[PDB]
Every structure is written in C-alpha cells, then in structure tokens.
C-alpha cells in the first residue's frame, strides 16, 4: 500500500494458467496486481541506475584565444603561408587585404592575409554512453498487509535487483511466499541511442545522432589533459572589417545556448551513481509460489471502531482504517456492502482479506465502493461498524477515463502498452503485431516533428480526408488526423 | 561620446535560498513570506499527497 496517493496507479486484475501476468513499470506510476486467491500487492520501479560509464565524445563549450600570429604576402603572387598553420592547436583563416606602397608592397592589388590563433579549450562537455552489461533496475514490491504505518510509505518494501545478466531475480516476501519476476530488461529506453551530457554537473539522456550533430567542436573523447579539437572554425569568429586587416575573437560561453538547445531532453540526476529516473520496464509476474497469510483464521465477533476518518482517494479507493476491540487477536476481519439496504455485495476489497494480528494494533483497509450509496458493514452482530459512503460518479465516466488512460499509455509506451497487464491471449498478440508494424511506419514518417507541426499536419490531413471521396477519407482521416492531433497534444511530456 | 545608459539586462544569474511550502487539498494555495520581495522569484505548482 506504498502505492496509495500517487495518483498514477493502475490496477492489473487478470491471471492465467501458471498464474503469470506481465505488467509495465514507468517510474511514474505504481502497479497494483489483484487476483482471486493471491494477496493483492503493488509494484513500483524505484530507480534505474548504470555504472562504469565510458566517454564517447567530448564537446567544447567555450574557448580562450592567445598568440594571435599573422602573415601576408605581396599581392598577385603566391598565397600567404605560416608554419603555425599545420599545428593542430591553431585555428587559421585566409583573407585578401588591399596592399600598396603605403603597406610596402611593390605592386598594388589585393593580397592574402592569414591569421592563426591558439584555441585552448575550456569547460568541456563530456558525452557518455552506457553498455547494457552494467545497467541495473531496482524493483520494490509490497503486499497489502494492513500494517499500522503502511499508507503510501515510500520506504518500507522488498527490493529485487534486475540486471541483463540475471534478469529473473525473484523477491522473497515475508509470510507471503515468493513473487517471481521474469522480466526482459533489454527492451525499454534503448540505451544504444543515449548519450549523457555531463555538462557542469547536469546530465541528460539525448538521442545519439542529435548529440553527434551538435555544431560545437568535438574532441577525440579519450582521457587526456590537452586533447586536440576538430572543427574549431565555428567557435572563433575572424572579423575582416573593411579590408586593411582582420582580427580574431573567441565566440563566448555556449552554456545558455546549450540549455535552450536541450529544451526537449529528459533530465537525469548525476551525482555519484548516474541514477536515471526516467524510463520504463516490462516485467512478468509469476505468482505461482505466492500465498496469502491467514486464510484459515477464524472470524472476528467484536466491536470495530474507526481511528481515522475514511477519505476517498483519487481513483475511488476509500482507505478504511479500523482498530479491533476484542480479545481474540489472530483473527480475520469480516466485511459487507449493501446498496440501499440490499445485499448485492457490489463492492470489492483491493486488500486481499485484512486480518488483525494484535489486539489493539490498528489495521487499515482499502475498499472500492460502488457508484451510488454504499453502506459498509465490517463487524458482525448489533455492534457492526457502519461506514456510510457515496462515490460521486457514473459507470460510463469511468469507462471514458479508462480509455483516456489507455490512450495516454499507448502514446507514451510505443507498443508495450499492448502487453501492459496482457494476460496471455491470442487477440492481444495480433493487436501488438498490428500496432507494432503501423507504429513503426508512423514514427519513421513523423520522426522529429514539432509539438505544433504535428497538430498543423494533422488538421491539414484530416481536412484532406474530409475532402476526398475515393474511400481515402475513411483511412486518411481516422488513421492520421485524429491520431496526430492526439499525439501532438501530448508529446511535450 | 558621453553615452547615457537606460537598461541593464542580465545574462548570468545565481539562485540562492530555495524555500518551499505545501498545503492539503482544498486548503488554498501555498503562501510564503518571501513572495513580497523584489529579489525573490517564486512559482506555484501542484503536488499530490
């Protein structure tokens, strides 16, 4: 119940033969997994972190210019040459300057003039890559136990370290069996297209090709104290004002320009371990060995009293918190739901089956009431605690919200949203294959399109669809216009 | 000669004394005494709890 209150949770409920259900973790939301006889637990991918990062390429952000040396030839003969030109550390440029008797040359006319300065770089920008060998995912799993201090408690949990070498690490929950994780960590944010821009103690996960296409001069990338820099011509600005001579000026410090050139990148915390916090992971949940505590306990026949007022969460759960008043401590809590004094039992306990483990140890229950009046009976007898509640909503509204949530998931996850909570099945396989093919084609088409250009192109294409009448309307409009507007209204995550 | 200035615009800033306040749902916006100071730049946001 470290999952309550996040506002991003989403409940997986299915189960199959061998009781395996694959769910997807996104660093933002915490999954909840309910089952018929398995204790409902919750999962959250805490932090993805890498280690032993190599440096692929180094970029200069600002420079200093010293030792400006110049040389000119007599006009109409030869071309100005300078021994310092061949040096890798020196930036040079050739220009033509008028010369005459005033300048000492014999014959009037334009003559070449080369100026060579010393480009000693400063404030490098390292660009680091990570191999899949060292990437590590940490996963936290908690079963709904009804402990006193376990409402959205970020700390207490069970951690399982997942690495590509050994990706089938199974958690060992106390008194609940062993939840088995068999996940593929190769999929996810493809780290073969990630270069970390460690630039003055701020990292970023940019695309590889975009990093290679940064105009700033690039170094060899090896570990040296005086690396040679290629493409130095664009961070020093030679200025030939009029035609008498030319000066040499260093451009400046490119940090502010870099920060606005990274306006779409995702930030990652870089201090010590480069613990990335954005990303997603697909994992299978093998719940065969997993059991629930105290299925055989007797029922409670005593008084129950609320110790904290019931307050509905964002998704409809109400978080009942009660304390036992009887003398039989190792006992099971009863439950009942009536809509309009009718035992329709149209409710559900997101907790598996809450049980009191001590006489006066408070226990908290997460129940899902129906959409109307819902009288909830906890104890038995005339002393049964009665929690009146009223969930304000409609069933169709919940379906619309679920559809919107699924659409957002399909927009963020490429096609793994088709596997999120996909309990086996053959229909989901065909859906995933179709979506994979069409999404690959669609992203190959709309590679690197603006937040507003997507909306504009979508409007234009849906208008084209509404115009054409050769049954191109039906596919053009539906397949491109609506999809592209929906995407372009979401892309800026 | 004899140029008169009329605007100074900044390039290099420095952020000091970051302070935060938060409040429960349906209890109003968070308020902080440092808002009524020229040097302070302060932005609201929404958090879940």
């Amino acid at each position: 119940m470290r999952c309550v209150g996040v506002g991003n949770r989403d409940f997986v409920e299915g189960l199959s033969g061998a009781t395996w259900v694959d769910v997807v973790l996104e660093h933002g939301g915490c999954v909840t997994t309910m089952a018929k006889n398995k204790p409902t637990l919750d999962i959250e991918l805490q932090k993805t972190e890498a280690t032993q990062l190599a440096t692929l390429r180094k970029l200069c952000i600002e420079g200093k210019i010293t030792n400006i040396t110049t040389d000119s030839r007599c006009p109409t003969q030869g071309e100005a040459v300078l021994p310092e030109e061949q040096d890798q550390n020196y930036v040079c440029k050739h220009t033509y300057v008028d010369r005459g008797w005033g300048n000492g040359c014999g014959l009037f006319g334009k003559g070449s003039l080369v100026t060579c300065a010393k480009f000693q770089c400063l404030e490098p920008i390292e660009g680091k890559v990570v191999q899949y060998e060292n990437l590590k995912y940490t996963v936290i799993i908690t079963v709904h136990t009804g402990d006193q201090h376990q409402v959205g408690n970020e700390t207490q949990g069970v951690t399982a370290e997942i690495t590509p070498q050994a990706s089938t690490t199974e958690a060992i929950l106390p008194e609940y069996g062993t939840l088995g994780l068999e996940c593929s960590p190769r999929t996810g944010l493809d780290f073969n297209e990630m270069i970390l821009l460690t630039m003055k103690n701020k990292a970023w996960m940019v695309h590889r090709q975009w990093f290679f296409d940064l105009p700033l001069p690039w170094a060899s990338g090896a570990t040296t104290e005086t690396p040679t820099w290629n493409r130095k011509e664009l961070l020093v600005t030679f200025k030939n004002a009029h035609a008498k001579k030319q000066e040499v000026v260093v451009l400046g410090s490119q940090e502010g320009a870099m920060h606005t050139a990274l306006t779409g990148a995702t930030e990652i915390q870089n201090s010590g371990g480069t613990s990335i916090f954005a990303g997603h992971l697909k994992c299978r949940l093998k719940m065969d060995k997993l059991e629930l505590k105290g299925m055989s306990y007797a029922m409670c026949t005593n008084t129950f009293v609320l110790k904290k007022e019931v307050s509905e969460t964002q998704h409809g759960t109400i978080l009942i918190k009660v304390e036992y008043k009887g003398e039989d401590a190792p006992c099971k809590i009863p439950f009942s739901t009536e809509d309009g004094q009718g035992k329709a039992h149209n409710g559900r306990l997101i907790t598996a089956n809450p049980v009191v483990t001590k006489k006066e140890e408070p226990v908290n229950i997460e129940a899902e009431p129906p959409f109307g009046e819902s009288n909830i009976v906890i104890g038995i007898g005339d002393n049964a605690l009665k929690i009146n509640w009223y969930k304000k909503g409609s069933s169709i509204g919940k379906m619309f919200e679920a559809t919107a949530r699924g659409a957002r998931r399909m927009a963020i996850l490429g096609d793994t949203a088709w596997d999120f909570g996909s309990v086996g099945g053959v229909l989901n396989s065909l859906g995933k294959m179709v979506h994979q093919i069409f999404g690959s084609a669609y992203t190959a088409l709309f590679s690197g399109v603006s937040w507003v250009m997507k909306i504009g192109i979508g409007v234009l294409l849906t208008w084209i669809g509404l115009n054409s009448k050769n049954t191109s309307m039906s596919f053009s409009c539906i397949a491109i216009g609506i999809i592209t507007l929906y995407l372009g209204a979401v892309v800026q995550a | 000669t004899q140029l008169a200035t009329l605007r100074k615009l900044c390039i290099e800033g420095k952020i000091t004394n970051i302070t935060t306040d938060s409040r429960c749902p349906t209890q109003g916006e968070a308020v902080l005494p440092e808002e009524q100071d020229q040097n302070y730049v302060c932005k609201h946001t929404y958090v879940d709890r």
Partner: antibody, heavy 122, light 113 residues
Framework: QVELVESGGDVVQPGKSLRLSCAAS????????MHWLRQAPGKGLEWVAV????????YYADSVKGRFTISRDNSKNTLYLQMNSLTPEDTAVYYC???????????????WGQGTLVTVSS | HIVMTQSPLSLSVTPGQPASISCKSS????????????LYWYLQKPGQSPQLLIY???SRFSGVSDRFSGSGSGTDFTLKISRVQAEDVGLYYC?????????FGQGTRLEIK
C-alpha cells in the same frame, strides 16, 4: 580569466594599524560578495571577514571580531580591509576570495587572490 | 562554529593508485530548505594559492581533473582520487559552508610514496 591581486602588505610593529587593499579585475565587482582569508605559516586556512553584495552587510570571525574593518570601493573595483590593534599572532598570508560563480550558497569561494604577507613583530 | 575533523593527516601514496580523504563534521551540514549539503574541498598546491576542487559534497568544480570525486550524506564525507599523479602534492583543506562563521579543517597532506 578573473584576476585578484593583493596590495598593502608590509611589516608592522604590534599595535600599529594597517589597511589592506584587494584590487579586483575580470568581472563586475558590485554584484559579488567578497571575503578576506588568512593562512598563518604552517597553520590551517582561517576565514577572516565577509562583505556581501550590499555594502552595508558585513560579518567578521569571532577570533578577529572587533579588531578589523572591511570596506568595499566598488566604484574603483577594489576591496578594502582595515586591520586595527594588530597582534603578533595576527601575522599570516592574507587572501581575497570572490563569491561563487555557480551554486546555492550566498557566500562561497571560487577564486583566490595571489596572496599578501603581513608580519606583526618587534 | 561547526568544527571540521579530518581523518587522515598524512597520505603517502604511490602514483597510479587511489586515495581516500575523510572530513567528518561535528553536525549535519544539510540545509533543510533545499536539501543540499554544503561541504567544499580546496587544494593549496605547494608554493601556490588554494583552488576549489568540489564545490559541493560530490559536484566537482570546473577545470578539475576527471578523477576527483566526493561522497558523504550527513557527517562522514570523502574525497576519492582514482589515479594519483605527481601533481597531487598539496593540502586538501575541506570546508563547511552551512553556517556563517565557516571553519576549515586542519587539512591533510599528500606525498608520493
């Protein structure tokens, strides 16, 4: 690229006051808090006094509190330190430290001056 | 008046070897409002003026070699050097910037073994 050069350091007998001056260059001075730090020979670095961006606000180390005075001539782009009632203990190499270029602390050191030596002895 | 105690007082290490310097505080230097930890590490090279290596607990300063990295959360901070060169001779004075009367440590010394 910034250059902080010391000035005013010389010999002085105990009890005779001295005024130190820190000349600054390479940056806009009026926006930077400045510090005075000293290192007695064979002793750890010991911060002396700080003046913030606004001229009025100043602070001094308790070991030297009430004996020194720190002033800012930002129009000339230089810092002033006034040493009064000097003690033979108060002999050290004195430094002039700028405010941090990037960070969160209102007062920090990023660039240290070349250093001047003041000797208080008889 | 937080007093800074450093664990090592002399560190003689051969070149191409790691090194660990410890600067232990008398109080947690973690500013509550921002959650940062203001501990600085300077190096005064012999016959030179002090530099600034790591302007936080672990975020190194500009112009500093690749090997200098720090750590520590509340009171036990470290300065890790990966491969010692011949230029690392100096005095690694740590410092706390949490409180106004900021005080340096005694400062360790590094020499080539």
């Amino acid at each position: 690229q910034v250059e902080l050069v010391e000035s005013g350091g010389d010999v002085v007998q105990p009890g005779k006051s001295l005024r130190l001056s820190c000349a600054a260059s390479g940056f806009t001075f009026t926006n930077y808090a400045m510090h005075w730090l000293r290192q007695a020979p064979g002793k750890g670095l010991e911060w002396v006094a700080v003046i913030s961006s606004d001229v009025n606000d100043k602070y001094y180390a308790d070991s030297v509190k009430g004996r020194f005075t720190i002033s800012r001539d930002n129009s000339k782009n230089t810092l002033y330190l006034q040493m009064n009632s000097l003690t033979p203990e108060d002999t050290a190499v004195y430094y002039c430290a700028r405010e941090q270029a990037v960070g969160t602390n209102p007062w920090a050191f990023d660039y240290w001056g070349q250093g001047t030596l003041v000797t208080v002895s008889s | 008046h937080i007093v800074m105690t450093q664990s090592p007082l002399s560190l003689s290490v051969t070149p191409g070897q790691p090194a660990s310097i410890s600067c232990k505080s008398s109080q947690i230097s973690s500013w509550g409002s921002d959650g940062k930890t203001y501990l600085y590490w300077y190096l005064q090279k012999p016959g030179q003026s002090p530099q600034l290596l790591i302007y936080e607990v672990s975020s190194r300063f500009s112009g500093v070699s690749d090997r200098f990295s720090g750590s520590g959360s509340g009171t036990d901070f470290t300065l890790k050097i990966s491969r010692v060169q011949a230029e690392d001779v100096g005095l690694y004075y740590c410092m706390q910037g949490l409180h106004l009367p900021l005080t340096f440590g005694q400062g360790t010394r590094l020499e080539i073994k």
